[PDB]
Amino acid sequence: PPIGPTRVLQPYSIVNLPPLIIGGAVLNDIYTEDPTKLPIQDILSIAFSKGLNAIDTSPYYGRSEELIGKALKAITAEWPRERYYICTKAGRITDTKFDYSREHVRESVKNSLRLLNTDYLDLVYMHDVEFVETPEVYDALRELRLMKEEGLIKAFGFSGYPVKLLYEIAYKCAHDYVEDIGRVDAILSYSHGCIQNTALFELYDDFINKCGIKKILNGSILSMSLLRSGKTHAFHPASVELKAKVDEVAQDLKKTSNIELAEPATRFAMKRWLFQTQPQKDPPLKWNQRTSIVLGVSTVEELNSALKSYADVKEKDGAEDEKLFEEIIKKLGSHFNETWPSGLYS
Amino acid sequence: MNFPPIGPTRVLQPYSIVNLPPLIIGGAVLNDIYTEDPTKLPIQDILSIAFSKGLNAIDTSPYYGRSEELIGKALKAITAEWPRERYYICTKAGRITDTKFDYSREHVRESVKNSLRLLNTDYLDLVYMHDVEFVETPEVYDALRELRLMKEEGLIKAFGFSGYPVKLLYEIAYKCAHDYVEDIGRVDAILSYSHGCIQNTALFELYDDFINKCGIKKILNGSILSMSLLRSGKTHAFHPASVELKAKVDEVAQDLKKTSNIELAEPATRFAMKRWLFQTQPQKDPPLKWNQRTSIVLGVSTVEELNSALKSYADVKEKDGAEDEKLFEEIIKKLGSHFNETWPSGLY
Amino acid sequence: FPPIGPTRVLQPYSIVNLPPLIIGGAVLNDIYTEDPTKLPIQDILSIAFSKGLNAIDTSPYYGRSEELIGKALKAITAEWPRERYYICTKAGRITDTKFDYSREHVRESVKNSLRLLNTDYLDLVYMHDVEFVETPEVYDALRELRLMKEEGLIKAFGFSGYPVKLLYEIAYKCAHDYVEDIGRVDAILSYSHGCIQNTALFELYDDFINKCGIKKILNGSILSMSLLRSGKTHAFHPASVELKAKVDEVAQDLKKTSNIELAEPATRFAMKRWLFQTQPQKDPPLKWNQRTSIVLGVSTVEELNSALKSYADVKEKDGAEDEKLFEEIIKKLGSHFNETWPSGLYS
Amino acid sequence: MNFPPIGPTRVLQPYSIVNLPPLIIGGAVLNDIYTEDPTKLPIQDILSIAFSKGLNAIDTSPYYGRSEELIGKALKAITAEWPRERYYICTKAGRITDTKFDYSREHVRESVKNSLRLLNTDYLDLVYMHDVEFVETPEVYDALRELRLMKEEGLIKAFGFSGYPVKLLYEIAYKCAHDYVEDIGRVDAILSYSHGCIQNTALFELYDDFINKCGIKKILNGSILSMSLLRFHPASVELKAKVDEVAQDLKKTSNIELAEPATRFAMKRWLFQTQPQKDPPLKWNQRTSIVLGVSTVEELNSALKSYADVKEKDGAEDEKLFEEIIKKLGSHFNETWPSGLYS
């Protein structure tokens, strides 16, 4: 079942990014090296046809931009540029390297425009803002704001892990820096909108109303594959005890119930974020268009599975779901809402 | 020279409608009410100084008589000194007279292209749907959809609407930001009037919900003297206020003109200026800091009134004002049951 | 998951080295080449081959299957030369109701198969669904396959179909009354009789091998044409309404009660009882009985991997909990366990 | 003087070693034992008539002394009337003397090459590993892997092994079909001897298991008179003495020659009764053959006459004589002797 329109709604608004956005990080070189995978142009074209007509990439994702850029040019006939959204980032070059100077932001965004084979991007985030001093974050945002007025980008924002730093940066943009920056169009938060950490859900009204944000994106709804049986996570930043409590709950759900943690943890992030951030009545729930979730889709399996949990959450009673949700959050008990360190911010 | 500029004498880059100056020249002084021979209103003089003093914004509407026509000429007459990129132009659409309202998307786009013609420019900074309480709300949303279009093409930089009942303004603004987020979205600005003065403060209390809940970028407060009702002067022209409130106000006018030799228009102006442009955000101590999300559209008809306005503004931003609060309260007590009294308007 | 077995054709040659899992080629048809989620045929064949599934089963009855697989095989000649894998196909069924077991047509059909599959020899040819023709015609068609085997056009011959007792009659007759002219068939393909809903094949295994002298037996439709599945996924299945209902009642029971998909324990039950428990075993790792194989479709890597996973589990995990579960499914099935449906002309 | 052929006088198509005829000419007679001067034996005359009566098969071994060469000379002599295609040739490998065996993979290949040379042909229908009980069982399986390849190569059409202890033969064949199904597979035929005869019937009670459990296609029964004891024998002295006592009274109390019931019993019980039977005429089970020892053309016609009596003549009075002979045979019935390394 298609989640939404397969075209960019007019009049244009970055609020119209679809409820599910392709996590374009997955389309890297390990992808083009796996004999099992479809050509990127095919996974992109199927996803688009189901209402996932938007991708999130970054220069930090290696050959993603070029690959996605490569694949985009081939589907021009069925999928011209005006049919989809393109989201990209600047500022994180490597796992350790950061340059937020204004010249680079223009360049990196310029480099992205050539690879993605477009003369405009829908959304550019400054990537992972907790890794730099905060005055450098504002000046970078001043650059993106000028790019937006130039018509090179339609919207600008930033991302990062610690959700209160995000609030402080967004707040100041809309207040103390309202001349130079103004409200940012969108923020991307991750691993704070999931069954083990809901701190994004509690801050949603403060982001929309007090920071004037137009659109909030929730990433890592499985917390970098932590909310998943079988230790799908290798070098997760979470503490050992968090990683072991999640492990515990996952096997205890595969053993007594044959339940894979990822499906109730997916439906929970889907339901609380995309629908319940606004008053609901009874199924069928109404999507809150100020929200989207970014998730990888590297197979048609992964895609129809996301499509099914979205449809399940949107259209089914889910009283049983709520009872399952309480138990998981209960079982995690102590480590619910536990965070880890990221960057220079405590 | 005289007074120093209250702000920049240019449109800040990057462009943002919130950079509309704290005070805006209001074009309704040129109407068929408020004078005859408005061709003899010194608009090209007020315009020349006000721009130099950082009031580089004008606000008008085709409803205000020959206003648009006469601003456009005065604007042309000053081009080499004040090129169009140096100031902001706000106009409106949808009201022809006082009983004939046309909110069709066809009339709106014709109205705007005609505004463009009379004001010698290819683009307008901000356009409102005019006095939304007279039209059925479904029409109001349909008219904002066309302004939303005009903004996306680049014919206008910003869009919004105006009207007397503030609670109806909130309902519409809210609907644009939630139910009609796809095809309308948050409006950039609203113009409220006779709700931000010494006789009616209801607008100040709604400030945070307008900005926060409805996502408005900029709120504009007009008729801070309530279409000259708050003038000590005397009785007033086509004013819908009841006899009582008229009779109460001008009683406080002819009171204030016996007891401390003071004209009601002075403290009323200072009152609106302070409560709206500054105290809508936290304020330590003077110098007070302007909340750039606010503006006042001023009824100025002679250069003397313009400089007087620059006066009351500097005094509110720098003075102590503890003595001003005293007189504010006495005015409001003398209003009493007539404080916050409204009159009907439109269909709402 | 790494390969089920060798990725070559063992020497000396023997039809009993057909791998434990064999690609069912029916689904490699039009509705495949058109599907955008589907890989190209040449790849899914290459991927399955490299995991030890280096055998394809197909049939002129399967539409364009033979042509499409035949092209796909030409494409991967460099990494997968003809000698690296097995080709099995069939003959004698042309449409869903038109059969032709005539010796002349049997030879036409096989020579067509070789053309379509870009090879000069086929590993195995069956006569398709023997129950639809008068038995005498079966043996005359088998004589022709025995001749094509003699002539080296095929490495092995046999027949396929649904009533397992008729399959036994036929194979026994070839090894006895017609020993001079036919002799033991190499192989038979049985289907819907080697699954959790019908084990009749499992019980006749030793008679087929010992009394009839068959060297290799194939079990297909281990989910009974997607009947052993929660999805009510069967197309136009011939099973009675009572059995269909009883199967789906169980399918929804296992979903509600234990969040179990019937097809997983059903697939594990088929693979363990057939590929392993047809010969003595000890504790895991279980030893595959090379006289057996299963024909399963694998049109996606997900299906391939799922298949590979169920094989690895049955082969190396304890399966004590499996056995308790298998018994629950079987008693839940009740009187519908081992129920058949009519097919062809046979009693 | 004639009697019809006992069966086809060509090689049936499709080819199958199950079509080895019910009686096969045993070339062990051309041995250095069993007659002095092998050149005397009228092998050309014996073969000429045998092929015409449908005994279109001969069995030999390098171990049989000059058997192969003289059989090879004789067959080249009749290649006009009998070309290679109309008859079957079987032979053996691995046994060189009464004590020397070479089951080495490379010798097995040399012996077959020599066999093909002597017998003047490019292929052989069947090759046996000879008398397996004398070599360590691992060596047997390796030699059969060689024969399995020579079969794939087309040098031979079928392969098996031979020997005395029948339960060892079951042991090897069962393993070839199960443990070693990948590089050997089921063997085509085995040849047993001295266990399918009036003094020993062990072969008859294993027939079903050889065919059904080992998947063997064809089983041959040799020395139905058990190396002419019933007419350097490894038989115990007591065993031969007891057979004489049974032969003496037979040659006196009824004036019957023990070899003639012993021969008909071996034919009936093996070529016919190994499948269900009823009223004559009897139906030869094609999974069986007997390898005869015939040294004159008379002997050949006598055996062919025995075949027809068992196949037709009632034989109620055959059964009575059979079961009296096993009665008279006493405790020695089913007795065996030692052979090689087995047990």
Coordinates of N, CA and C in Angstrom, one line a residue, chain C residues 27-192:
Chain C
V27 N 8.6 -21.0 -11.3 CA 8.4 -19.6 -11.0 C 9.4 -18.7 -11.8
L28 N 10.4 -19.2 -12.5 CA 11.2 -18.4 -13.3 C 10.6 -18.3 -14.7
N29 N 9.6 -17.4 -14.8 CA 8.7 -17.3 -15.9 C 8.4 -15.8 -16.2
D30 N 7.4 -15.6 -17.1 CA 7.1 -14.2 -17.5 C 6.9 -13.3 -16.2
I31 N 6.0 -13.7 -15.3 CA 5.6 -13.0 -14.1 C 6.8 -12.7 -13.3
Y32 N 7.9 -13.3 -13.6 CA 9.2 -13.0 -12.9 C 10.0 -11.9 -13.7
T33 N 10.3 -12.2 -15.0 CA 11.1 -11.3 -15.8 C 10.6 -9.9 -15.8
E34 N 9.2 -9.8 -15.6 CA 8.6 -8.5 -15.6 C 8.6 -7.8 -14.2
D35 N 8.8 -8.5 -13.1 CA 8.7 -7.9 -11.8 C 9.9 -7.1 -11.4
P36 N 9.7 -5.8 -11.1 CA 10.8 -4.9 -10.8 C 11.5 -5.2 -9.5
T37 N 10.9 -5.8 -8.5 CA 11.5 -6.3 -7.3 C 12.4 -7.5 -7.6
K38 N 12.2 -8.1 -8.7 CA 12.9 -9.4 -8.9 C 14.3 -9.1 -9.6
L39 N 15.3 -9.8 -9.1 CA 16.6 -9.8 -9.8 C 16.5 -10.4 -11.2
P40 N 17.5 -10.3 -12.1 CA 17.5 -11.0 -13.3 C 17.7 -12.5 -13.0
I41 N 17.2 -13.3 -13.9 CA 17.2 -14.8 -13.7 C 18.7 -15.3 -13.6
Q42 N 19.5 -14.7 -14.4 CA 20.9 -15.2 -14.4 C 21.6 -15.0 -13.1
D43 N 21.1 -14.1 -12.3 CA 21.8 -13.8 -11.0 C 21.3 -14.7 -9.9
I44 N 20.0 -14.8 -9.8 CA 19.4 -15.7 -8.8 C 19.8 -17.1 -9.0
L45 N 20.0 -17.5 -10.3 CA 20.7 -18.8 -10.6 C 22.1 -18.8 -10.2
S46 N 22.9 -17.7 -10.4 CA 24.3 -17.7 -10.0 C 24.4 -17.7 -8.5
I47 N 23.5 -17.0 -7.8 CA 23.6 -16.9 -6.3 C 23.3 -18.2 -5.7
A48 N 22.2 -18.8 -6.2 CA 21.8 -20.1 -5.6 C 22.8 -21.2 -6.0
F49 N 23.4 -21.2 -7.2 CA 24.4 -22.2 -7.6 C 25.6 -22.1 -6.6
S50 N 26.1 -20.9 -6.3 CA 27.2 -20.7 -5.5 C 27.0 -21.0 -4.0
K51 N 25.7 -21.2 -3.6 CA 25.4 -21.8 -2.3 C 25.1 -23.3 -2.3
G52 N 25.6 -24.0 -3.3 CA 25.4 -25.5 -3.4 C 24.1 -26.0 -4.0
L53 N 23.3 -25.1 -4.5 CA 22.0 -25.4 -5.1 C 22.2 -25.4 -6.6
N54 N 23.2 -26.2 -7.1 CA 23.7 -26.2 -8.5 C 22.9 -27.2 -9.3
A55 N 21.6 -27.1 -9.2 CA 20.6 -28.0 -9.9 C 19.3 -27.2 -10.1
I56 N 18.8 -27.2 -11.4 CA 17.6 -26.5 -11.8 C 16.6 -27.6 -12.2
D57 N 15.3 -27.4 -11.9 CA 14.2 -28.3 -12.3 C 13.3 -27.4 -13.1
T58 N 12.9 -27.9 -14.3 CA 12.0 -27.1 -15.1 C 11.2 -28.1 -16.0
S59 N 10.4 -27.5 -16.9 CA 9.4 -28.3 -17.7 C 8.8 -27.4 -18.9
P60 N 8.6 -28.0 -20.1 CA 7.9 -27.3 -21.1 C 6.5 -26.9 -20.7
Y61 N 5.9 -27.6 -19.7 CA 4.7 -27.2 -19.1 C 4.8 -25.9 -18.3
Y62 N 6.0 -25.5 -17.9 CA 6.1 -24.3 -17.1 C 6.3 -23.1 -18.0
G63 N 5.6 -23.0 -19.1 CA 5.5 -21.9 -20.0 C 6.8 -21.5 -20.7
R64 N 7.3 -20.3 -20.4 CA 8.6 -19.9 -21.0 C 9.7 -20.2 -20.0
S65 N 9.5 -21.0 -19.0 CA 10.5 -21.3 -18.0 C 11.8 -21.9 -18.7
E66 N 11.6 -22.8 -19.6 CA 12.7 -23.5 -20.2 C 13.5 -22.5 -21.1
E67 N 12.8 -21.6 -21.8 CA 13.5 -20.6 -22.7 C 14.2 -19.6 -21.8
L68 N 13.5 -19.1 -20.8 CA 14.1 -18.0 -20.0 C 15.3 -18.5 -19.2
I69 N 15.2 -19.8 -18.6 CA 16.3 -20.4 -17.9 C 17.4 -20.7 -18.9
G70 N 17.0 -21.1 -20.2 CA 18.0 -21.4 -21.2 C 18.9 -20.2 -21.6
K71 N 18.3 -19.1 -21.7 CA 19.0 -17.9 -22.0 C 19.9 -17.5 -20.8
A72 N 19.3 -17.5 -19.6 CA 20.0 -17.2 -18.4 C 21.3 -18.1 -18.2
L73 N 21.2 -19.3 -18.6 CA 22.3 -20.2 -18.5 C 23.4 -19.9 -19.5
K74 N 23.0 -19.4 -20.7 CA 24.1 -19.0 -21.6 C 24.8 -17.8 -21.1
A75 N 24.2 -16.9 -20.3 CA 24.8 -15.7 -19.9 C 25.9 -16.0 -18.9
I76 N 25.8 -17.0 -18.0 CA 26.7 -17.3 -16.9 C 27.7 -18.4 -17.3
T77 N 27.8 -18.6 -18.6 CA 28.8 -19.7 -19.1 C 30.2 -19.5 -18.5
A78 N 30.6 -18.3 -18.4 CA 32.0 -18.1 -18.0 C 32.3 -18.5 -16.6
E79 N 31.5 -18.0 -15.6 CA 31.7 -18.5 -14.2 C 31.0 -19.8 -13.9
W80 N 29.9 -20.1 -14.6 CA 29.1 -21.4 -14.4 C 29.0 -22.1 -15.7
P81 N 30.1 -22.8 -16.1 CA 30.0 -23.6 -17.3 C 29.0 -24.7 -17.2
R82 N 28.6 -25.3 -18.3 CA 27.5 -26.3 -18.2 C 27.8 -27.5 -17.3
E83 N 29.1 -28.0 -17.3 CA 29.5 -29.1 -16.4 C 29.4 -28.8 -14.9
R84 N 29.1 -27.6 -14.5 CA 29.1 -27.2 -13.1 C 27.8 -27.4 -12.4
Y85 N 26.7 -27.8 -13.1 CA 25.4 -27.9 -12.5 C 24.6 -28.9 -13.2
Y86 N 23.4 -29.2 -12.6 CA 22.5 -30.2 -13.1 C 21.3 -29.5 -13.8
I87 N 20.8 -30.1 -14.9 CA 19.5 -29.7 -15.5 C 18.6 -30.9 -15.5
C88 N 17.4 -30.7 -14.8 CA 16.3 -31.7 -14.9 C 15.2 -31.0 -15.6
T89 N 14.5 -31.7 -16.5 CA 13.3 -31.2 -17.1 C 12.3 -32.4 -17.3
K90 N 11.2 -32.1 -17.9 CA 10.2 -33.1 -18.0 C 9.6 -33.1 -19.4
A91 N 8.6 -34.0 -19.7 CA 8.0 -34.1 -21.0 C 6.6 -34.8 -20.8
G92 N 5.8 -34.5 -21.8 CA 4.5 -35.3 -21.9 C 3.3 -34.5 -21.5
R93 N 3.5 -33.3 -20.8 CA 2.4 -32.5 -20.4 C 2.6 -31.1 -21.1
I94 N 1.7 -30.8 -22.0 CA 1.8 -29.6 -22.8 C 1.0 -28.4 -22.3
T95 N -0.3 -28.7 -21.9 CA -1.1 -27.7 -21.2 C -1.7 -28.4 -19.9
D96 N -2.5 -27.6 -19.2 CA -3.2 -28.1 -18.0 C -4.2 -29.2 -18.3
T97 N -4.6 -29.4 -19.6 CA -5.4 -30.6 -19.9 C -5.0 -31.4 -21.1
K98 N -3.9 -31.0 -21.8 CA -3.5 -31.7 -23.0 C -2.1 -32.4 -22.7
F99 N -2.2 -33.7 -22.8 CA -1.0 -34.6 -22.6 C -0.7 -35.3 -23.9
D100 N 0.6 -35.7 -24.0 CA 1.0 -36.5 -25.2 C 2.2 -37.3 -24.8
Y101 N 2.0 -38.5 -24.5 CA 3.1 -39.4 -24.1 C 3.6 -40.3 -25.2
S102 N 3.3 -39.9 -26.4 CA 3.7 -40.7 -27.6 C 5.2 -40.6 -27.7
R103 N 5.8 -41.7 -28.1 CA 7.3 -41.8 -28.2 C 7.9 -40.8 -29.1
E104 N 7.2 -40.6 -30.3 CA 7.7 -39.5 -31.2 C 7.7 -38.2 -30.5
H105 N 6.6 -37.8 -29.9 CA 6.5 -36.5 -29.2 C 7.5 -36.5 -28.1
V106 N 7.7 -37.6 -27.3 CA 8.7 -37.6 -26.2 C 10.0 -37.2 -26.7
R107 N 10.4 -37.7 -27.9 CA 11.7 -37.3 -28.4 C 11.8 -35.9 -29.0
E108 N 10.7 -35.5 -29.7 CA 10.6 -34.1 -30.1 C 10.8 -33.2 -28.8
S109 N 10.1 -33.5 -27.8 CA 10.1 -32.6 -26.6 C 11.5 -32.5 -26.0
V110 N 12.1 -33.6 -25.8 CA 13.4 -33.5 -25.2 C 14.4 -32.8 -26.1
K111 N 14.4 -33.1 -27.4 CA 15.3 -32.4 -28.3 C 15.0 -30.9 -28.3
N112 N 13.7 -30.5 -28.1 CA 13.4 -29.1 -27.9 C 14.0 -28.6 -26.7
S113 N 13.9 -29.3 -25.5 CA 14.5 -28.9 -24.3 C 16.0 -28.6 -24.4
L114 N 16.7 -29.5 -25.0 CA 18.1 -29.3 -25.2 C 18.4 -28.0 -26.0
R115 N 17.7 -27.8 -27.1 CA 17.8 -26.5 -27.8 C 17.5 -25.3 -26.9
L116 N 16.4 -25.4 -26.2 CA 16.0 -24.2 -25.4 C 17.0 -23.9 -24.2
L117 N 17.7 -25.0 -23.7 CA 18.5 -24.8 -22.5 C 20.0 -24.8 -22.9
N118 N 20.3 -24.7 -24.2 CA 21.7 -24.4 -24.7 C 22.7 -25.5 -24.3
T119 N 22.3 -26.8 -24.3 CA 23.1 -27.8 -23.9 C 22.9 -29.0 -24.9
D120 N 23.9 -29.9 -24.9 CA 23.7 -31.1 -25.7 C 23.4 -32.3 -24.9
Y121 N 23.2 -32.2 -23.6 CA 22.8 -33.3 -22.7 C 22.0 -32.7 -21.5
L122 N 21.0 -33.5 -21.1 CA 20.2 -33.1 -19.9 C 20.5 -34.2 -18.8
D123 N 20.6 -33.7 -17.5 CA 20.9 -34.6 -16.5 C 19.8 -35.6 -16.2
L124 N 18.5 -35.1 -16.2 CA 17.4 -35.9 -15.8 C 16.1 -35.4 -16.5
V125 N 15.4 -36.3 -17.0 CA 14.1 -36.1 -17.7 C 13.1 -37.0 -17.1
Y126 N 11.9 -36.4 -16.6 CA 10.8 -37.2 -16.1 C 9.7 -37.2 -17.1
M127 N 8.9 -38.2 -17.1 CA 7.5 -38.1 -17.7 C 6.6 -37.4 -16.6
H128 N 5.9 -36.3 -17.1 CA 5.2 -35.4 -16.3 C 3.8 -35.9 -15.9
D129 N 3.5 -36.0 -14.6 CA 2.2 -36.3 -14.1 C 1.5 -37.5 -14.8
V130 N 2.2 -38.7 -14.6 CA 1.8 -40.0 -15.1 C 0.3 -40.3 -14.9
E131 N -0.3 -39.8 -13.8 CA -1.6 -40.2 -13.5 C -2.7 -39.8 -14.5
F132 N -2.3 -38.9 -15.4 CA -3.3 -38.4 -16.4 C -3.4 -39.2 -17.7
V133 N -2.5 -40.2 -17.9 CA -2.6 -41.0 -19.1 C -2.8 -42.5 -18.6
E134 N -3.4 -43.2 -19.5 CA -3.5 -44.7 -19.3 C -2.1 -45.3 -19.1
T135 N -2.0 -46.0 -18.0 CA -0.7 -46.5 -17.6 C 0.1 -47.1 -18.7
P136 N -0.4 -48.0 -19.6 CA 0.4 -48.5 -20.7 C 1.2 -47.5 -21.5
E137 N 0.6 -46.3 -21.7 CA 1.3 -45.2 -22.4 C 2.4 -44.7 -21.5
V138 N 2.4 -44.9 -20.2 CA 3.5 -44.5 -19.4 C 4.8 -45.3 -19.7
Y139 N 4.6 -46.6 -19.8 CA 5.8 -47.5 -20.0 C 6.4 -47.3 -21.5
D140 N 5.5 -47.0 -22.4 CA 6.0 -46.8 -23.8 C 6.8 -45.5 -23.9
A141 N 6.4 -44.5 -23.2 CA 7.2 -43.2 -23.1 C 8.4 -43.4 -22.3
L142 N 8.4 -44.3 -21.3 CA 9.6 -44.6 -20.5 C 10.7 -45.4 -21.4
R143 N 10.2 -46.3 -22.2 CA 11.1 -47.0 -23.1 C 11.8 -46.0 -24.0
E144 N 11.2 -44.9 -24.4 CA 11.8 -43.9 -25.2 C 12.9 -43.1 -24.4
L145 N 12.6 -42.8 -23.2 CA 13.6 -42.1 -22.3 C 14.8 -43.1 -22.1
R146 N 14.5 -44.4 -21.8 CA 15.5 -45.4 -21.6 C 16.4 -45.4 -22.9
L147 N 15.8 -45.2 -24.1 CA 16.6 -45.1 -25.3 C 17.4 -43.8 -25.4
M148 N 16.8 -42.7 -25.0 CA 17.5 -41.5 -25.0 C 18.7 -41.5 -24.0
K149 N 18.5 -42.1 -22.9 CA 19.6 -42.4 -22.0 C 20.7 -43.2 -22.6
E150 N 20.3 -44.3 -23.3 CA 21.2 -45.2 -24.0 C 22.0 -44.3 -25.0
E151 N 21.4 -43.4 -25.7 CA 22.0 -42.6 -26.7 C 22.8 -41.4 -26.1
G152 N 22.8 -41.3 -24.8 CA 23.6 -40.3 -24.2 C 23.0 -38.9 -24.2
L153 N 21.8 -38.8 -24.7 CA 21.1 -37.5 -24.7 C 20.7 -37.1 -23.3
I154 N 20.4 -38.1 -22.4 CA 20.1 -37.9 -21.0 C 20.9 -38.8 -20.1
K155 N 21.2 -38.3 -18.9 CA 22.0 -39.1 -18.0 C 21.2 -40.0 -17.1
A156 N 19.9 -39.7 -17.0 CA 19.0 -40.4 -16.1 C 17.5 -40.0 -16.5
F157 N 16.6 -41.0 -16.2 CA 15.2 -40.8 -16.5 C 14.4 -41.3 -15.4
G158 N 13.1 -41.0 -15.5 CA 12.1 -41.4 -14.5 C 10.8 -40.7 -14.8
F159 N 10.0 -40.5 -13.8 CA 8.6 -39.9 -13.9 C 8.2 -39.2 -12.6
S160 N 7.1 -38.5 -12.8 CA 6.6 -37.7 -11.7 C 5.1 -37.7 -11.6
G161 N 4.5 -37.4 -10.5 CA 3.1 -37.3 -10.3 C 2.6 -37.5 -8.9
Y162 N 1.3 -37.4 -8.7 CA 0.8 -37.2 -7.3 C 0.4 -38.5 -6.6
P163 N -0.4 -39.4 -7.1 CA -0.7 -40.6 -6.3 C 0.5 -41.5 -6.1
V164 N 1.0 -41.6 -4.8 CA 2.3 -42.3 -4.6 C 2.1 -43.8 -4.8
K165 N 0.9 -44.3 -4.6 CA 0.7 -45.7 -4.9 C 0.9 -46.1 -6.4
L166 N 0.3 -45.2 -7.2 CA 0.5 -45.4 -8.7 C 2.0 -45.3 -9.1
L167 N 2.7 -44.3 -8.5 CA 4.1 -44.1 -8.7 C 4.8 -45.4 -8.4
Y168 N 4.4 -46.1 -7.3 CA 5.0 -47.4 -6.9 C 4.8 -48.5 -7.9
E169 N 3.5 -48.7 -8.2 CA 3.1 -49.6 -9.2 C 4.0 -49.5 -10.5
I170 N 4.1 -48.2 -11.0 CA 4.9 -48.0 -12.2 C 6.3 -48.4 -12.0
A171 N 7.0 -47.8 -11.0 CA 8.4 -48.1 -10.8 C 8.7 -49.6 -10.6
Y172 N 7.8 -50.3 -9.8 CA 7.9 -51.7 -9.6 C 7.8 -52.5 -10.9
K173 N 6.8 -52.1 -11.7 CA 6.7 -52.8 -13.0 C 7.9 -52.6 -13.9
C174 N 8.6 -51.5 -13.8 CA 9.8 -51.3 -14.7 C 10.9 -52.1 -14.3
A175 N 11.0 -52.4 -13.0 CA 12.1 -53.2 -12.4 C 11.8 -54.6 -12.4
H176 N 10.6 -55.1 -12.9 CA 10.3 -56.5 -12.8 C 9.7 -56.9 -14.2
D177 N 8.4 -56.8 -14.5 CA 7.9 -57.3 -15.7 C 8.6 -56.7 -17.0
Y178 N 9.1 -55.5 -16.9 CA 9.7 -54.8 -18.0 C 11.1 -54.5 -17.8
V179 N 11.8 -55.4 -17.1 CA 13.2 -55.2 -16.8 C 14.0 -55.2 -18.0
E180 N 13.7 -56.1 -19.0 CA 14.6 -56.1 -20.2 C 14.5 -54.8 -21.0
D181 N 13.3 -54.3 -21.1 CA 12.9 -53.1 -22.0 C 13.1 -51.8 -21.2
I182 N 12.9 -51.7 -19.9 CA 13.0 -50.5 -19.2 C 14.0 -50.6 -18.0
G183 N 13.7 -51.5 -17.1 CA 14.6 -51.6 -15.9 C 14.2 -50.5 -14.9
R184 N 14.9 -50.5 -13.8 CA 14.7 -49.5 -12.7 C 14.8 -48.1 -13.3
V185 N 13.8 -47.3 -12.9 CA 14.0 -45.9 -13.2 C 15.0 -45.3 -12.3
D186 N 15.7 -44.2 -12.8 CA 16.7 -43.6 -11.9 C 16.0 -42.8 -10.8
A187 N 14.8 -42.2 -11.1 CA 14.4 -41.2 -10.1 C 12.9 -41.0 -10.3
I188 N 12.3 -40.6 -9.2 CA 10.9 -40.2 -9.2 C 10.7 -38.9 -8.4
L189 N 9.8 -38.0 -8.9 CA 9.5 -36.8 -8.2 C 8.1 -37.0 -7.7
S190 N 7.9 -37.0 -6.3 CA 6.7 -37.0 -5.7 C 6.4 -35.6 -5.0
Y191 N 5.1 -35.3 -4.9 CA 4.8 -34.0 -4.3 C 3.6 -34.0 -3.5
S192 N 3.5 -33.1 -2.5 CA 2.4 -33.1 -1.6 C 2.2 -34.3 -0.8

